[PDB]
Motif scaffolding. Structure first.
Motif, PDB file in Angstrom:
ATOM      1  N   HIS A   1      -5.558   9.422  -0.945  1.00 34.01           N
ATOM      2  CA  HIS A   1      -6.750  10.139  -0.075  1.00 34.01           C
ATOM      3  C   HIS A   1      -6.192  11.048   0.817  1.00 34.01           C
ATOM      4  O   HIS A   1      -4.823  10.707   1.079  1.00 34.01           O
ATOM      5  CB  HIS A   1      -7.823   9.365   0.790  1.00 34.01           C
ATOM      6  CG  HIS A   1      -7.033   8.423   1.709  1.00 34.01           C
ATOM      7  ND1 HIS A   1      -6.249   7.179   1.395  1.00 34.01           N
ATOM      8  CD2 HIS A   1      -6.429   8.428   3.110  1.00 34.01           C
ATOM      9  CE1 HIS A   1      -5.531   6.608   2.277  1.00 34.01           C
ATOM     10  NE2 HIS A   1      -5.775   7.356   3.348  1.00 34.01           N
TER      11      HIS A   1
ATOM     12  N   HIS B   1      -6.190  12.935   5.182  1.00 31.74           N
ATOM     13  CA  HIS B   1      -6.553  12.932   6.219  1.00 31.74           C
ATOM     14  C   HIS B   1      -6.291  14.390   6.887  1.00 31.74           C
ATOM     15  O   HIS B   1      -5.440  15.308   6.361  1.00 31.74           O
ATOM     16  CB  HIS B   1      -6.047  12.246   7.675  1.00 31.74           C
ATOM     17  CG  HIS B   1      -5.968  10.678   7.021  1.00 31.74           C
ATOM     18  ND1 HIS B   1      -7.038   9.897   7.481  1.00 31.74           N
ATOM     19  CD2 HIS B   1      -5.212   9.887   6.284  1.00 31.74           C
ATOM     20  CE1 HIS B   1      -6.607   8.677   6.869  1.00 31.74           C
ATOM     21  NE2 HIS B   1      -5.760   8.791   6.311  1.00 31.74           N
TER      22      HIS B   1
ATOM     23  N   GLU C   1      -1.888  12.370  10.667  1.00 38.09           N
ATOM     24  CA  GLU C   1      -1.746  10.955  11.319  1.00 38.09           C
ATOM     25  C   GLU C   1      -0.518  10.839  12.080  1.00 38.09           C
ATOM     26  O   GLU C   1      -0.257  10.688  13.069  1.00 38.09           O
ATOM     27  CB  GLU C   1      -2.194   9.757  10.308  1.00 38.09           C
ATOM     28  CG  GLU C   1      -3.430  10.222  10.114  1.00 38.09           C
ATOM     29  CD  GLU C   1      -4.250   9.009   9.716  1.00 38.09           C
ATOM     30  OE1 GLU C   1      -3.855   8.097   8.839  1.00 38.09           O
ATOM     31  OE2 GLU C   1      -5.548   8.715  10.185  1.00 38.09           O
TER      32      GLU C   1
ATOM     33  N   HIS D   1      -2.041  10.294   1.656  1.00 41.71           N
ATOM     34  CA  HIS D   1      -1.645   8.715   1.577  1.00 41.71           C
ATOM     35  C   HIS D   1      -1.839   8.370   0.210  1.00 41.71           C
ATOM     36  O   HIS D   1      -3.112   8.262  -0.349  1.00 41.71           O
ATOM     37  CB  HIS D   1      -2.504   8.108   2.259  1.00 41.71           C
ATOM     38  CG  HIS D   1      -1.931   8.272   3.965  1.00 41.71           C
ATOM     39  ND1 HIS D   1      -2.978   7.842   4.994  1.00 41.71           N
ATOM     40  CD2 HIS D   1      -1.092   8.780   4.429  1.00 41.71           C
ATOM     41  CE1 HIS D   1      -2.522   8.059   6.056  1.00 41.71           C
ATOM     42  NE2 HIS D   1      -1.216   8.901   5.757  1.00 41.71           N
TER      43      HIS D   1
ATOM     44  N   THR E   1      -4.610   2.745   8.716  1.00 40.88           N
ATOM     45  CA  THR E   1      -4.839   3.770   9.529  1.00 40.88           C
ATOM     46  C   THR E   1      -6.473   3.725  10.052  1.00 40.88           C
ATOM     47  O   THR E   1      -6.963   4.625  10.867  1.00 40.88           O
ATOM     48  CB  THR E   1      -4.233   5.281   9.467  1.00 40.88           C
ATOM     49  OG1 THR E   1      -4.830   5.910   8.542  1.00 40.88           O
ATOM     50  CG2 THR E   1      -2.706   4.954   9.503  1.00 40.88           C
TER      51      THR E   1
HETATM   52 ZN    ZN Z   1      -4.848   7.286   4.991  1.00 41.42          ZN
END
Ligand code: ZN
Length: 255
Positions: free
Chosen positions: A90, A92, A102, A115, A194
């Motif tokens: 996925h 962010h 992140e 990630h 996270t």
């Molecule tokens: Zn992640």
């Protein structure tokens, strides 16, 4: 995973007290404090047999899910002992090209962060692995905006079919090797998931070289929705947790 004005990351510690724990992620990577570690073994990304299955909007991000019932796509080497199986990836991302990652590098924020989540096969299944300090290995890759990433376009073009929370679509025969940068040079440290439940089960491996994606590709990420179908629209943007205190950890460099 609240990311709004009223339930975002600063609120998570009320439901998940580990949010203020000793090995939370992400972190800022201070490139002048990280130290080269000659004990690190070569990193092995073995994705030739990867079997993608589906893409899902889970109201937090979208996950591209893999068949992890056999060692088809694994990560080994580096700081890792044993074999870690790919279960999903996925991203962010931000509302603006100057934010979205992140992890940060010398406080620099990238437009997004990929990630690739893997679980340690010695623990048998993902749910057992997240209960262990060495249960997961997450490969983190920064995204900057510039030229288009051809290997990302199949992902971008299915997003219209998973606009809202709870929607999924078939996503077979996707090759995650197309999302990797040229260099596998990385930083590594012990951390956490996270998003809630923020469990402290992750060996983080963050690549130094970002991949480039186009403005048009990231704009399509930003058309996704946090809400379910038929609800008032809430664009899926700024689904990132900011940097957490490093505390008693050392970030090691492979280079
Ligand atoms: Zn992640």
């Amino acid at each position: 995973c609240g990311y709004g004005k009223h339930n975002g990351p600063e609120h998570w510690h009320k439901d998940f007290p580990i949010a203020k724990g000793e090995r939370q992620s992400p972190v800022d990577i201070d490139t002048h404090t990280a130290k080269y570690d000659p004990s690190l073994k070569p990193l092995s990304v073995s994705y030739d047999q990867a079997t993608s299955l589906r893409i899902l909007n889970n109201g937090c991000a979208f996950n591209v899910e893999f068949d992890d019932s056999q060692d088809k796509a694994v990560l080994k080497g580096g700081p890792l002992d044993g074999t870690y199986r790919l279960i999903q990836f996925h991203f962010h991302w931000g509302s603006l090209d100057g934010q979205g990652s992140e992890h940060t590098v010398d406080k620099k924020k990238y437009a997004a962060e990929l990630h690739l989540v893997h679980w340690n096969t010695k623990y048998g299944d993902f749910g057992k692995a997240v209960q262990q300090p060495d249960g997961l290995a997450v490969l983190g890759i920064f995204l900057k905006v510039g030229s288009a990433k051809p290997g990302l376009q199949k992902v971008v073009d299915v997003l219209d079919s998973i606009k809202t929370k709870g929607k999924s679509a078939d996503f077979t025969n996707f090759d995650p090797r197309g999302l990797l940068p040229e260099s596998l040079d990385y930083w590594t440290y012990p951390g956490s998931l996270t998003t809630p439940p923020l469990l402290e089960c992750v060996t983080w491996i963050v690549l130094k070289e970002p991949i480039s994606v186009s403005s048009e590709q990231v704009l399509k990420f930003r058309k996704l929705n946090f809400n379910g179908e038929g609800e008032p629209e809430e664009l899926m943007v700024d689904n990132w947790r900011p940097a957490q205190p490093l505390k008693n950890r050392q970030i090691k460099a492979s280079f």
